[PDB]
């Protein structure tokens, strides 16, 4: 009862040479997609009632949610690049590409139902509706969520030395920009429907990058076992029902910042109005370059679960250290330029039009939760990421919202300038991440002692 996250520090010998460096090109293709994004935010500004995010960023709810589930194969296919048959590893890949097209047709379907923001209780930014050509970014761009899980089941099979996605998901974005506008108003193209037709544009390119899976059964030996992706085995055939208790714990634990989603957009609508809806050129600039950070480990999740296949127990989960603390180098040594700098004349009117003449009560948490979390889930793209341990890592997150529920109405109740106020036990909620996780990561690298059951051999 002074330490119960056993032998903490050690995850070190001379590991200066843990080179997960093509594991940043797993998320530099992801600034590549991150940045289509604005080119149709400030691209469908050709229409000015096309604030359009009004559906496009409430589509990407059942994206990044079902997204979780999918990018939950990162174990499987890295971990069985410790066995041999990339086609049994791949008859998952296939059975999941069956998922990523099966659950894919539920985004595709729960989206249909979806279209009834014809509803109200509190202020504009969530009720007011008049002309909605969001009407159709709901469909023209939610009729995709099928080919968009496959188009991700792609890099969920880049868990073994391909960044053949950084290749595409750039010669992908660039295809869209062109395309994108053709539909807002264009050429020979379907030139009219514009504020949803930035969405038929976006979603168009999903199906294009959807077949940048196809065209990468190409540069060596297969990941194509696309025989009838069919199932049936017991009551319901796994390698698919297995995908289940990796899926569940993840999207449902992506529904962390899925309520730090309706935390962030429920403190602009008290008398907060003005500069409290700039906690969003702030927390927009959280995600923006938090993504290449964060997802260094949602790409390190390879190098770990992969190298338990190749049975190097903790010759991996003790790089799950010097991979943890390596972007954790600039996790703080660039949380510096987050509390420091601003939205100055380096901000114009982009992702959220609100720049010239608002307070810096926004960098006051670009340190609070910021590095105190930076890693605190790359701790999970390394627990799940390594192990099953998203199991209830799920219930890592039942905390960071029930440990930070009360720091919701604790900006609204404050002692001082409590704008970073309900960032209270939602930077302590969110730094009892510094525990529970990386707790079962010394429950858990202390696992591959119990596991590495013959310490070494002979000569």
């Amino acid at each position: 009862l002074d330490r119960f996250s056993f032998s903490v520090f050690l995850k070190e010998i001379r590991l200066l040479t843990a080179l997960a460096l093509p594991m940043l090109l797993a998320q530099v293709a992801q600034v590549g997609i991150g940045f289509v994004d604005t080119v149709m935010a400030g691209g469908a500004g050709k229409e000015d009632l096309a604030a359009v995010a009004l559906g496009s960023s409430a589509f990407a709810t059942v994206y990044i949610t079902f997204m979780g589930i999918m990018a939950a194969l990162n174990p499987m296919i890295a971990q069985l690049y410790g066995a041999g048959k990339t086609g049994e590893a791949g008859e998952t890949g296939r059975q999941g590409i069956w998922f990523g097209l099966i659950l894919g047709i539920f985004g595709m379907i729960l989206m249909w139902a979806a279209i009834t923001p014809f509803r109200n209780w509190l202020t504009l930014s969530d009720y007011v509706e008049g002309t909605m050509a969001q009407y159709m970014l709901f469909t023209s761009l939610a009729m995709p969520a099928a080919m968009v899980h496959r188009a991700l089941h792609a890099y969920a099979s880049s868990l073994n030395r391909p960044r053949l996605i950084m290749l595409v998901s750039f010669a992908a974005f660039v295809l869209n920009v062109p395309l994108n506008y053709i539909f807002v108003y264009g050429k020979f193209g379907m030139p009219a429907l514009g504020g949803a037709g930035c969405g038929v544009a976006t979603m168009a390119v999903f199906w294009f990058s959807a077949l940048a899976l196809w065209i990468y059964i190409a540069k060596e030996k297969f990941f194509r076992p696309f025989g009838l992706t069919a199932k049936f085995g017991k009551p319901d055939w796994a390698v698919f029902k297995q995908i289940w208790k990796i899926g569940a714990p993840i999207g449902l634990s992506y529904f962390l910042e899925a309520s730090a989603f309706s935390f962030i957009v429920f403190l602009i609508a008290p008398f907060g109005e003005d500069y409290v809806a700039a906690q969003q050129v702030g927390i927009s600039l959280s995600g923006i370059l938090y993504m290449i950070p964060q997802s260094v480990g949602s790409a390190g999740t390879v190098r770990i679960g992969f190298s338990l296949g190749r049975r190097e127990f903790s010759r991996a989960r003790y790089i799950s250290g010097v991979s943890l603390v390596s972007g954790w180098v600039l996790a703080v040594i660039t949380v510096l330029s987050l509390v420091l700098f601003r939205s100055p004349l380096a901000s114009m009117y982009n992702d959220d039009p609100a720049v010239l003449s608002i307070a810096s009560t926004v960098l006051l948490f670009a340190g609070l939760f910021q590095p105190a979390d930076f890693t605190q889930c790359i701790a999970s793209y390394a627990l799940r990421g390594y192990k099953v341990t998203k199991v209830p890592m799920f219930i890592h997150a039942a905390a960071f919202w029930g440990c930070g529920l009360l720091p919701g109405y604790l900006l609204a109740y404050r002692f001082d300038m409590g704008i970073y106020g309900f960032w209270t036990a939602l930077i302590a909620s969110l730094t009892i991440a510094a525990v529970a996780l990386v707790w079962c990561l010394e429950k858990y690298s202390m696992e591959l002692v119990k596991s590495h059951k013959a310490v070494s051999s002979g000569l």
């Binding site: 049975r311 119990k450 596991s451 590495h452 059951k453 013959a454 310490v455 051999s457 002979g458």
Partner: protein, 91 residues
């Protein structure tokens, strides 16, 4: 004129029986005898036996927690034995 099936590992068991997954870089002529005992020195030895690049199998591990020690055996070229290797880590 060599050494052993030179890896070791028993990752887990099914705390009644046990998976024993070790080295076999190919085979040789091919064969594995595997010893089967505690380290009591009492309760006699017994014999698992496998084929290919397969020393990578799993015992019928009857008894409970008790210390168990267990060796695999190369067999090659000469219908004799290239070398053996063993670990003792039980339930």
């Amino acid at each position: 004129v060599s050494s052993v099936p030179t890896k070791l590992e028993v990752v887990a068991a099914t705390p009644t029986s046990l998976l024993i997954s070790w080295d076999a870089r190919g085979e040789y002529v091919v064969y594995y005898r595997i010893t089967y005992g505690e380290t009591g020195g009492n309760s006699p030895v017994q014999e698992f036996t496998v084929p290919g690049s397969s020393s990578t199998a799993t015992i019928s591990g009857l008894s409970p927690g008790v210390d168990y020690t267990i060796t695999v055996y190369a067999r090659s070229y000469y219908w004799g034995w290239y070398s053996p290797i063993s670990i003792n880590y039980r339930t």
